[PDB]
Amino acid sequence: MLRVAVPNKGALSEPATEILAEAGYRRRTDSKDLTVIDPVNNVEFFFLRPKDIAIYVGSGELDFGITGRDLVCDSGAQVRERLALGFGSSSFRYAAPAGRNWTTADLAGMRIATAYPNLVRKDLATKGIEATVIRLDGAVEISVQLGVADAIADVVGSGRTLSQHDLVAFGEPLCDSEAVLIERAGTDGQDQTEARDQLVARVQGVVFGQQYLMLDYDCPRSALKKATAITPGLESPTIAPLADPDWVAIRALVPRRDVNGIMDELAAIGAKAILASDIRFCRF
Amino acid sequence: MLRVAVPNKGALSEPATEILAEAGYRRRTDSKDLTVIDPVNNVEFFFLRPKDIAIYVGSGELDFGITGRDLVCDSGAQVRERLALGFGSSSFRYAAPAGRNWTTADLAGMRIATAYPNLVRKDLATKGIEATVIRLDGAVEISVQLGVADAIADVVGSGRTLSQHDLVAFGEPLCDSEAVLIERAGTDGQDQTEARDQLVARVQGVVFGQQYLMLDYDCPRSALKKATAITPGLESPTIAPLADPDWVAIRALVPRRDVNGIMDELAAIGAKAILASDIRFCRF
Amino acid sequence: MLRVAVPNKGALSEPATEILAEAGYRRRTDSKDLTVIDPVNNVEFFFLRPKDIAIYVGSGELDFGITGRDLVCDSGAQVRERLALGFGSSSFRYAAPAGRNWTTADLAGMRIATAYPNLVRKDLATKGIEATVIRLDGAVEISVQLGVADAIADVVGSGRTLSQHDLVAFGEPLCDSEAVLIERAGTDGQDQTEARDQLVARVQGVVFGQQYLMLDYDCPRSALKKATAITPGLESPTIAPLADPDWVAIRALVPRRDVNGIMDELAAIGAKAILASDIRFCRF
Amino acid sequence: MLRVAVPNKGALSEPATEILAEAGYRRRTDSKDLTVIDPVNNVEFFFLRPKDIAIYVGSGELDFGITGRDLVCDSGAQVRERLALGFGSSSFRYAAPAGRNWTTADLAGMRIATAYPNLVRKDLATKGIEATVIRLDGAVEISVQLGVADAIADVVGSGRTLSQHDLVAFGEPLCDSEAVLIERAGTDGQDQTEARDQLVARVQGVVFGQQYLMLDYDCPRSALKKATAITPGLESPTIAPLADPDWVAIRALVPRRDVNGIMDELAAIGAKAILASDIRFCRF
Amino acid sequence: MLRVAVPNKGALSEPATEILAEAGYRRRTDSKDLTVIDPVNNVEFFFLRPKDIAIYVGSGELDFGITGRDLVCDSGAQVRERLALGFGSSSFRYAAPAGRNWTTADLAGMRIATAYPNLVRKDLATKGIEATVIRLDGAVEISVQLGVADAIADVVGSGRTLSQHDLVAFGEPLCDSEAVLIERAGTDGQDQTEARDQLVARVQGVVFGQQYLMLDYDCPRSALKKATAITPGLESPTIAPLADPDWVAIRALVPRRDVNGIMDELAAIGAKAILASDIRFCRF
Amino acid sequence: MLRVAVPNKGALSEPATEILAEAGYRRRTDSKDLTVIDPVNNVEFFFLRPKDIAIYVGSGELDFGITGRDLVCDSGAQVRERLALGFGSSSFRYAAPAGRNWTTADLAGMRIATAYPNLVRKDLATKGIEATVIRLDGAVEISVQLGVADAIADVVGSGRTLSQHDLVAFGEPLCDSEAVLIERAGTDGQDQTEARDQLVARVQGVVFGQQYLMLDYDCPRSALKKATAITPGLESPTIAPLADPDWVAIRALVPRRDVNGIMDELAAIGAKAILASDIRFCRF
Ligand SMILES: N[C@@H](Cc1c[nH]c[nH+]1)C(=O)O
Ligand SMILES: N[C@@H](Cc1c[nH]c[nH+]1)C(=O)O
Ligand SMILES: N[C@@H](Cc1c[nH]c[nH+]1)C(=O)O
Ligand SMILES: N[C@@H](Cc1c[nH]c[nH+]1)C(=O)O
Ligand SMILES: N[C@@H](Cc1c[nH]c[nH+]1)C(=O)O
Ligand SMILES: N[C@@H](Cc1c[nH]c[nH+]1)C(=O)O
């Protein structure tokens, strides 16, 4: 029996449930209750505060959690990052009032407000800089106008929050917010290593599969050699005859980020009815 | 022209609309209005109170409805259950205050509160027991604390509601809450038998299809004989050559509940890029 | 870099985002902010008032928009309609109090209330009729009861709004509400013609693909000649052997509106496990 | 310790909480939980389904409830109606399809759908009429179109629901929906009679007070005799001098429904600064 | 029977209903339906789009409406403004991109976007300036960035919307957004003049009363002469004895905006228990 | 110009805005924006995270804030508590799994989870006990079941959260959650001492006034001496004649918690029309 911690609210909650569903786990019956028991898969899911998930995995009984990479950097927990999940990512920056040409060295002896004080204190220490780091519970950007701090450190999205308070980011970026699957450190006893390996392989199938599309298309046999070079697939393309003997159908996996260039090339050699379909799971 | 009753709210409403959409019927334009006319399929959908749907099919002009099996047991309507739809199921139990070792025979002459009084009265009669059954409109669990009844009878999910009121279930379970497609009894006149048969076949295609996944995978020809035994499919697996002549691609339907064991076996004989896809409709 | 205007609310908003997602564009991160930048596709999406989108494309810097055909008729903008998108369509009618046998000629010299005054004034002019057209901001049906107008002109859905105010539609219908992709008129400079052509081809792939389903089915070889005539596909059906040598699997695109007749015919010649799957993109 | 049942949702819920607050009882801390304990007043409030409240008072341990008068007529409970609360009232009527001149005698042997079957069966019996009364859970108006019943019986507001289904009300009205304070029948033991009397007196203070306004106004002494006749108050008006010796200020309770006529009369005899204030509690 | 138009949504809707309630009219039973009939006061209220209310009063059968003063300036309707209601007010300004020193004369021949084109065209004409005014449906501030206009004209609150798009207001302000009670022009026939006068007097009682508070306080008789000068009231203060013969209680209306200075002065001459209460209606 | 911090969400937010409104400050225009400027009172209100308000007052530029007393204990800020506001109060307790007879001394060397780690660490130190205090972001009760802690420390309301996780509170209570007005420590410069004193006096007027009701009642002169003893008021009751010379009207402040006993006594000596009204502000 495995126990898995899932974010109960915020930007990571829906895509976390989505990826767990595509790996074949029971979806949350209703957003009101806070556990979901999966008897067929032998897993129980707990919906918890995002900022706490790393502590639950690292000091508690949870085998796995899904949380942001910055929240693991801030927690001080000793957990293993098994997979980057491909969503939720965003930079983490120092920021200060526009129009003063701030640089990292200006932070020495200043007051820096953040919701991630342990992350920031370790970053400054590595750079050899001492400052006064002030923990706040949320929305730190207004703390400069209101006199609590000289600079801040926070997740930045597209900079909307910074510009709305006349702040400019500076310095080298910190530990980012990408969603990760974390695992409790420790070997335990074989029979539990196996159940843990199974969950990781299943989530990995979604993480990998979601990077590709399946292309299906009709192709003249005369253009078949060129098509094979254009879509080599993961092993080699599938080739099947059509009723018309001068034609075949070709099936091949292609990366999402390559798809439109690939289709233009296929169209130019005579390919017709070029179909593209979502992949949600693939065990390579 | 067929008329079909659909639950307008509650746990059965979204999965009911989902299954009707996958059978190819027009989805509800907006959740505010209460009918949806499907001119191409020649069907009209009415969104009604769940507890009333069985009466509308059994005494009204509706040809079909989707409701819970317990609501058909409680209604006294004479309708045909054509299909179990595979969602919404839950046990229906007697329950009484924890710590008293209640058994079914203790109900004789007691006061039993329930939202399904006809269901309960028929269950007790079959067992030869007489008691006083008290109809309530909803949420019956609090009626024991408040002195209206000695025991209750209600749908139980995972027992959250019972434990939150210090109640323990006992006795043989009653008619459960699984969602069913019900049909009005009666033969009418041939031309309407045909239209009715068509809807049932279409919903049955979703009910059946949703129990499987399509597996696609690349396979060495040397492992082909073993693969065929591992995934026999519904008739026999599809086999197509890859460009590489030592390899093929195999397609086969497999039951959802079998999928992960099947993939482990395929991986161990040399299969690569094992893909798994949702099935939403299959006419066997 | 392309700029595309998307309806920010109303009946057209979700299906507009849906079609853009299926063409492979970044979906709106959250419904609160009003732009979405797509760096990989080199497109920026702006979420605007539906009634304004035609003016933004026709007089502004936007390259494309998605809006209703009636809103283009009302705007007076000079834009190109590139594609009908297949949703949101509804008739646009004159309407007047029930029980008076209104005809189009009765409008001469009357007061007509509408949210689309330029559309209505051009329609009347073409028919040679002069009347007083009164602009209102919304919900015009009540304006007759309240004495502001003698008749109205409005989008009609299924006539719910008309019957709820005792109004009956009459006359030839006007410019309808179907969703369209519009483009700014003008040739600019080659390098921008190409980027524009790419977006249109991608949306066209969704518009075309969404009219079909992929049929997959197992078929006895003895029935193969008949099956080929029943499902000719877009080019010709794919044919692949099963393990069992007396059988094959057939793949073919078929129109959504044909699917159930097609399956009945296939069942009657011996086809088994007839599968039907959504198509979301097809470049013919 | 008293236990009081309060409607947990619907049209009666907010005005019920409002009247209990004005009688000085602790207001519901948050709409999520379902009890509120009032330690200073020695009362506990339970928020329950409206249709069940009469059964909880009549067969349970609750001392009081607030519910509709029709729900008491339908419940069959033996409870005392202590006060009409002055909100929620509405007529209860038979109704049938427009354009057929239905009368009460046409109901004999017909099918009548209603959410209040016991109320309707007793009403028909008193009139000497036999019919088939069909219990439904809610929204009964559509049951005629859908073939379940020939006529209905339901609360009517302003007839919106009737006209929206082409129904016309007929016959003598039934037990109406006005909100009432009900009490469990029975004398118990003196010390509990006293606590019960206290709650009734406190709610009665709100019921009575809410029918009046306090008028305050400045008045010339020369017009004082006429003013006294215009506002006699509940006992006799309060009269106090102003600094200016030719003037006084007058205070008097007047009925809400009389207020504007009263003010016109006072203005015409020389009264100035006529103030009118809400009364929320008055023990006569 | 009077008909009154009330804003159905937006910033003016709740305070409009609030002021009508304090004048003693029936409050909207539920926000879903769109009329409210007041049988005791002989008035019917219609909840309409704010931008349309002036047209309904000026060309329709409505006797009164509540809307913004700018919406009357934009409508071109011939209505009487009877009262300023004391809420909803905000300036209406031209605005253009920051950092260019725009002045009113720079508008000549430019493109100006606004939701109030008739208001703007009349303002420019009075100043002798010709420009191209572009009607938009809402949120006009983004139209400059997007190339549709050179400048805008819009209601400004505290400038949040302007600064969020880098716009600066300039020039003389236009017709503002303060809420007003408007009346249809025309004398009709005596018996309807009277009913109209009554509504205006009742709303005026709220408009006037809401500018004051009632002060009540205990005062030594030795300080009575000074107190009388500090709170003269609307006519002269009320003076009543306390049980203690060296003391009195004083009652007087004072303006809300004066209240705190007044209390400081009273405290400094020996006044105790200085009470201050809301006034919701006063007929002077 | 004063700056005041107000809770932006949670149980303290609405009653905080309510008390500020009754002291005569501008109410939040809309819950979306996060500042409100009051030009007439010369105060600006900032709506912030509750857990941060003490830090904003203690280290920032804010003059005042409203927050929970426990949040001040947890913050470590050096602020002055000027007033207890009379809402939001609740006990703060250690808690551990039911059925083990936990006492305070059992905490030595254990793991204690809490959202208020500084509060807990100072409480344990004062008692001479060392333990490991684990910071969590919220909802700490589940941390025992999930293995992160042996005991917790949290605000308890009525114990719903404790019993829902099988926890029992024990030990002496900690710093409670009552809402307080806090002020920045420091004298600054006279002209700002005065503006600060004014706000405190105004909030104090609400805090004091809200503990009383105004009683108004008609009284026979023969019972006047007894009535004066029953309602002495804050100074002495107001006495004014009625028109009827055998009667008077009496006005007196009485404590809310005394009101019903007081009215029973007045009724028994002949008092009639006993009226009771809310007090929202009183400067003693
Ligand atoms: N043979 C193709 C398609 C495929 C992958 N898996 C199964 N089929 C490829 O290797 O990409
Ligand atoms: N031939 C495989 C896959 C398939 C089913 N239907 C069409 N193809 C099977 O029978 O399972
Ligand atoms: N060969 C089939 C199926 C197919 C289309 N595209 C790829 N395969 C057809 O032409 O319809
Ligand atoms: N004396 C007035 C006002 C009043 C009632 N109660 C107290 N004062 C009346 O009897 O109506
Ligand atoms: N006499 C005081 C209070 C009052 C007004 N109206 C009635 N009483 C004044 O004139 O202001
Ligand atoms: N004189 C009464 C009522 C009152 C207070 N303030 C003004 N009037 C009292 O002192 O309680």
Number of H helices, E strands in chain F: 8, 16
For every residue of A100-139, DSSP letters joined together read S---GGGGTT-EEEES-HHHHHHHHHHTT---EEEE-SS-
C-alpha distance from E75 to closest chain D C-alpha (Å): 33
**Which residues of C fall within a CB distance of 8 Å from B198?**
260
What is chain A's length?
Answer: 284
Q: What's the rounded Cα separation, in Å, for the pair D174 and D131?
A: 16
Distance from CA of B16 to the nearest CA of C (A): 19
User: Token digits for C156?
Assistant: 């009609």
**Contact: D260, E40; criterion CB under 8 Å:** no
CB C103 within 8 A of CB C122: no
Closest CA relative to residue A31, chosen from A47, A18, A51: A47
CA distance B272 to chain D (A): 52
- Distance between CA atoms of C219 and C29, rounded to whole angstroms? 45
- Position of tokens 């409050």? E27
Q: After which residues is chain E broken (C to N over 2.5 A)?
A: none
Which amino acid appears at position D253 of this protein? L
State how far the Cα of B193 lies from the Cα of E220, in Å rounded to an integer: 96
| End-to-end C-alpha distance for chain A, whole angstroms | 26
Ligand 4: residue whose CA is nearest its atom 4:
D252
DSSP classification of residue D214: E
Q: Do D275 and E284 touch (CB under 8 A)?
A: no
Give the position of tokens 């008068």: D69
Residue bearing the CA closest to ligand 5, atom 6: D217
Other beta carbons within 10 Å of B128: 8
What's domain E91-176's superfamily in CATH? Periplasmic binding protein-like II (3.40.190.10)
- Other CB atoms within a 10 A radius of the CB of residue D50 amount to 23
Q: Are B22 and B206 in contact (CB under 8 A)?
A: yes
**Chains contacting F with at least 3 CB pairs below 8 Å?**
A, D, E
CA distance E213 to A159: 48
Check: CB of residue A164 under 8 Å from CB of residue A154. no
Through-space distance between the first and last CA atoms of chain F, rounded to whole angstroms: 26
Experimental approach:
X-ray
Judge: D148–B49 Cβ closer than 8 Å, yes or no: no
Amino acid at B139: A
Chain B residues whose beta carbon lies within 8 Å of the beta carbon of residue D7: none
Burial track E87-121 (b if 16+ CB lie within 10 A, e otherwise)? bbebbbbbbbeeeeebeeebbeebbbbbbbbebbb
Q: Find tokens 């001068």 and name the residue.
A: A246
Phi, psi of D88 (to 5 degrees): 75, 5
Using CB atoms, which chains have 3+ pairs under 8 A with D?
B, E, F
Task: Give residues with Cβ within 8 angstroms of F190, minimum separation 6.
Answer: none
Is there a contact between E235 and D247 (Cβ–Cβ < 8 Å)? Answer: yes
Torsional class of C19: left (φ above 0), alpha (ψ -120 to 50), beta (otherwise):
alpha
Q: Nearest by CB to D243, from E198, E236, E283: name it.
A: E236
Distances (CA, A) of B145 to B137, B148, C138: 17, 8, 53
Q: Is A209 in the pocket of ligand 1 (CB under 6 A)?
A: no
Is F282 near ligand 6, meaning CB less than 6 Å away?
Answer: no
The structure tokens listed for C128 are: 């040679």
Interface probe for A, chosen from F44, F137, F145 (most Cβ of A below 10 Å), is F137
Ligand 2 proximity of B249 Cβ (cutoff 6 Å): no
- Neighbouring CB atoms inside 10 A of D114's CB total 24
DSSP-based three-state secondary structure for F208: helix
List the single residue in F33, F238, F280 with the smallest CB-CB distance to E242.
Answer: F238
CB-CB under 8 Å, B138 with D52: yes
The answer for residues whose C-beta is within 8 angstroms of residue B222's C-beta and 6 or more apart is B246, B270
- Angle among Cα A117, A118, A123 to the nearest 5 degrees reads 100
Are the beta carbons of F241 and D239 separated by less than 8 Å? Answer: yes
CB contact at 8 A, B217 and B271: yes
- Report residues whose beta carbon is within 6 angstroms of any ligand 4 atom: D 233-238, 251-253; F 216-218, 242, 249, 273, 275
Distance from CA of E106 to the nearest CA of F (A): 33
* Domain B212-278 class, CATH top level: alpha beta
As a CATH number, domain F1-84+179-211 is 3.40.190.10
Cα A27 to ligand 1 centre (Å): 29
Ligand nearest to the CA of C250: 2
> β-strand B79-84 against A282-283: which pairing, if any?
unpaired
Structure tokens at F273: 């029309």
Spatial separation of the C-alpha atoms in residues B266 and C243, rounded to whole Å: 17
Q: Which residues of B246-282 are buried (b: 16+ CB within 10 A; e: fewer)?
A: ebbbbbbbbeeeebbebbeebeebebbbbbbbbbbbb
Is the CB of B237 less than 8 angstroms away from the CB of C243? Answer: yes
C-alpha span between E151 and E107 (Å, rounded) = 8
CATH 3.40.190.10 residue window(s) in chain C = 1-84+179-211, 91-176
∠ CA E105-E108-E111 to the nearest 5 degrees?
Answer: 120
- Give the residue ranges of DSSP H helices in chain B: 13-22, 53-59, 69-75, 117-126, 160-163, 191-209, 224-230, 259-267
* Pick from C6, C61, C15, C59: nearest CA to C33: C6
Pocket test for ligand 4, best of F214, F216, F218, F275 (most atoms within 8 A of CB): F218
| Token pair in block for residue A251 | 């099936």
Write the residue in A51, A60, A142 that is nearest to F146 by C-beta: A60
- Residue entry with tokens 């009683």: F215
Give the other-Cβ count within 10 Å of F156's Cβ.
20
D219 lines ligand 5 (CB under 6 A): no
Kindly identify which residue of chain C lies nearest to residue A249, measuring between CA atoms: C238
Assess whether the C-beta atom of F105 lies below 6 angstroms from ligand 6: no
Alpha helices in E31-116 (DSSP H): 53-59, 69-75
- Which stretches of chain F sit within 8 Å of chain E by CB? 24, 30, 33, 37, 40, 198, 202, 209, 214, 228, 233-240, 251, 253, 279-284
DSSP letter at F162 equals H
Helix (H) or strand (E) segment spanning residue D18 = helix D13-22
Query: Which chain D residues are Cβ-neighbours of B79 within 8 angstroms?
Result: none
> Which residue type, as a one-letter code, is found at position B35?
T
Residues of D in contact with B52 (CB under 8 A): 136-138
Nearest C-alpha neighbor of D20 from the set D168, D206, D212, D187 = D206
**CB atoms C242 and B240 under 8 Å:** no
Q: How far is CA E32 from CA E7, E35, E47, F220, in A?
A: 13, 9, 10, 51
- The SS3 assignment for D15 reads helix
Atom of ligand 3 nearest to the CA of C282: 6
Q: Is the CB of F253 under 6 A from ligand 6?
A: yes
Instruction: Give me the total of CB pairs closer than 8 Å, taking one residue from chain C and one from chain E.
Output: 60
Query: Cα separation of F181 and F72, whole Å?
Result: 11
A10-28 burial by CB neighbour count: b if 16+ within 10 A, else e? Answer: ebbbebbbebbebbbbbeb
Whole-angstrom distance, CA of residue D152 vs CA of residue D166? 12
| Chains within contact range of chain B (3+ C-beta pairs < 8 Å) | A, C, D
Ligand 3 site: residues with CB under 6 angstroms? A 216-218, 242, 249, 273, 275; C 233-238, 251-253
List the beta bridge partners of residue E38: E43
- When CB atoms are compared, the residue of B56, B134, B137 closest to D146 is B56
The bound ligand whose nearest atom lies closest to the alpha carbon of B272 is 1
For residue F231, CA distances in Å to D15, D192, D234, F236, F253 come to 32, 29, 21, 8, 8
Rounded to the nearest angstrom, the minimum Cα separation between B252 and chain C is 10
Q: Which of F114, F152, F157, F158 is nearest to F136 (CA)?
A: F114
* CB contact (8 A) between residue A138 and residue F55: no
Q: How many CB atoms lie within 10 A of CB A29?
A: 13
Spatial separation of the C-alpha atoms in residues F238 and F227, rounded to whole Å:
11
Mutate which of F235, F251, F254, F282 to disrupt the E interface (most E C-beta within 10 Å)? Answer: F235
Please tell me which of the candidates C30, C202, C279 has its beta carbon nearest to residue A275. C279
